[PDB]
Every structure is written in structure tokens, then in C-alpha cells.
Amino acid sequence: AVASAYQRFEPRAYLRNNYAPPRGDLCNPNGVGPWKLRCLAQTFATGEVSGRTLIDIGSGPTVYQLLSACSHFEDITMTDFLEVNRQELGRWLQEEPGAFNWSMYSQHACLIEGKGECWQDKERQLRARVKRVLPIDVHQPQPLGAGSPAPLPADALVSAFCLEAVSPDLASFQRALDHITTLLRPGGHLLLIGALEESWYLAGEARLTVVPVSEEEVREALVRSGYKVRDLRTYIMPAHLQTGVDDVKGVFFAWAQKVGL
Ligand SMILES: Nc1ncnc2c1ncn2[C@@H]1O[C@H](CSCC[C@H](N)C(=O)O)[C@@H](O)[C@H]1O
Ligand SMILES: Ic1ccc2c(c1)CNCC2
């Protein structure tokens, strides 16, 4: 019944707690922002994660997870359980009034990528390759998509801070991973980002209860769902980024491959 709590979920409050200074201050490489974008950039740069279609699970109201990604997939599908978020994304996609400012992220994605690309061009490419923003439920065996417009099976998947924050225990987590794994074409690629050993986090009036997992549980979960863990790293949250919006211990990045056998 996490969904009950997600009802009071305030996108703007979420964005302010996680993507605005101090966490959203991308000057200083020892930060989470830099590190997350770095993991993403380095993985795609290997040019092994490629194709035509891509799906972002539980996008929430953020876009940074697709910045380096868009350069490799012409058809990008963003998703999220809450409508308030799907709406929040739209303000940025359609450049509506009061959309969130991802300038800094776009810029650092461009710095890290080193293609001499300007942020305006990248944001333009992301907004372009994002075809639709569909509603999704990782808890359903067929992720809120009975006959979804999304091209299936996707050639790759990306998820940042979703699963751990939607499931109440390690088992839900595992099943949710299985669910989404079904959307991934065999031999496909998965880029998983999430909170390590986190139990709760605020988002306005909402107070989400989440499953504290470990780099090892996640790895196992990945292997159990039928993946070849290509890369798995962990960033330890510094004291300075430990504000009172949650109790994260660290953050993990996972590059997994749907092993086709
Ligand atoms: N059952 C469910 N299935 C999929 N997404 C869900 C869900 N229940 C809640 N969510 C959404 O999953 C998100 C997790 S937190 C936001 C994650 C975002 N990718 C980021 O990095 O900031 C929230 O936006 C929440 O509304
Ligand atoms: I750093 C970072 C980014 C996103 C989120 C958290 C921490 C903690 N709560 C889930 C959302």
C-alpha cells in the first residue's frame, strides 16, 4: 500500500530535496550529481548499450537519467505511476511555465561527455527523442501496459530510485525487478540507480517507507532476475549531503545485461 503514501507526493518538494543545492550543486566532483552522471556517461560511452527503443521506469519528475542516454536511442519512453509527475515532466518537455530547471545537469552531462556539445543542443535532443510519458506500475506482472504504445521489447532500460522506493520488502523489490525485466529484449541492457540502505524519505507531506537494500542484495536480485551484472558501483553519501530529507547511506549504480541463453 505504498501507493497510498505516494498520493500525497509533491513533485516540486521532491525536486527541491534532491536536485537543488546541496545535492544539486554540481560544482565539486565529490558530489552525487557528478558521480551519477559520470556512471551514466561512462557506460554509454563504451558504446555497448545501444539500439532504437529505450524505456525509463519510474521517471518521477526528473530527466537527468536520460541526458547521456538520449544520444544512443531515437525512441525514448518515460514513465511513472503518479500523474502529478507525468505532468511535471510535461512542463519540461513542452517547455511550459514553471518547469524544472535542469541546466546544470545538462551542462555537466555535456562536460563529462566531452563532445563539445552545448547544453541547449542536448536538452533539445532529449526533448525530441522522448516520444511519450506513460503511466506505469512495477507491481503489475505486465507493468501498467496491457497494450502500451511503448515499442516492446525495449532495447534498453533505465531506472533511478524507483524499485527500492515502491516496494515494502526485499521480496517485492525482487518481483518488481522481474516485472520490468520482462520489458527488456534478451541481450538487452539495464541501467539501475538507487538508494543503498535507505528506509524513508520526504517529498512534501508524503513520507515514503522504503526498503533498505545493500550492494550485495541488489547484485543478487539482479542475478536472480536473469542478468549478467556488467558493472556495480557504490557512492557513499558524504556528511554534507546528509540533510534531513531521508536517511540514505549511499547510492548504487548497476549496469546489467539480460542474459540471453
Ligand atoms: N508502483 C509504482 N511503479 C512505478 N513507479 C512508481 C510506483 N509507485 C511510485 N512510483 C514512482 O517512482 C518514483 C520513485 S523516486 C523518483 C525517481 C526518479 N527517477 C529520480 O531519480 O528522481 C516516484 O516518482 C514515484 O511516484
Ligand atoms: I542523492 C538521491 C536522489 C534521489 C533520491 C534520494 C537521494 C533519496 N530518496 C529517493 C530519491
Descriptive terms for the model:
monomer; alpha/beta; Rossmann fold; seven-stranded mixed beta sheet; globular; binds S-adenosyl-L-homocysteine; transferase; methyltransferase
Question: Any overview of this molecule?
Answer:
The protein is of the alpha/beta class and 261 residues long. It has one domain: 3-Layer(aba) Sandwich (Rossmann fold). It is 33% helix and 24% strand. The protein is built from nine helices and nine strands. The strands form two sheets. It has a seven-stranded mixed β-sheet, sandwiched between helices. A two-stranded antiparallel ribbon has the order 6-7. Strand 6 (200-203) and strand 7 form a beta hairpin. Helix 3 crosses helix 5 (103-113), helix 5 packs across helix 6 and helix 8 crosses helix 9. The relative contact order is 0.17. The structure holds S-adenosyl-L-homocysteine (SAH) and 7-iodo-1,2,3,4-tetrahydro-isoquinoline. S-adenosyl-L-homocysteine binds at residues 3, 6, 9, 58-60, 62, 65, 80-82, 85, 136-139, 160-162, 165-166. S-adenosyl-L-methionine binds at residues 14, 19, 58-59, 64, 80, 85, 137-138, 160. One of its GO terms (cellular component) is cytosol. Its EC number is 2.1.1.28. InterPro entries: NNMT/PNMT/TEMT_CS, NNMT_TEMT_trans, SAM-dep_methyltransferase, SAM-dependent_MTases_sf. Catalyzes the transmethylation of nonepinephrine (noradrenaline) to form epinephrine (adrenaline), using S-adenosyl-L-methionine as the methyl donor. Other substrates include phenylethanolamine and octopamine. Also methylates normetanephrine.
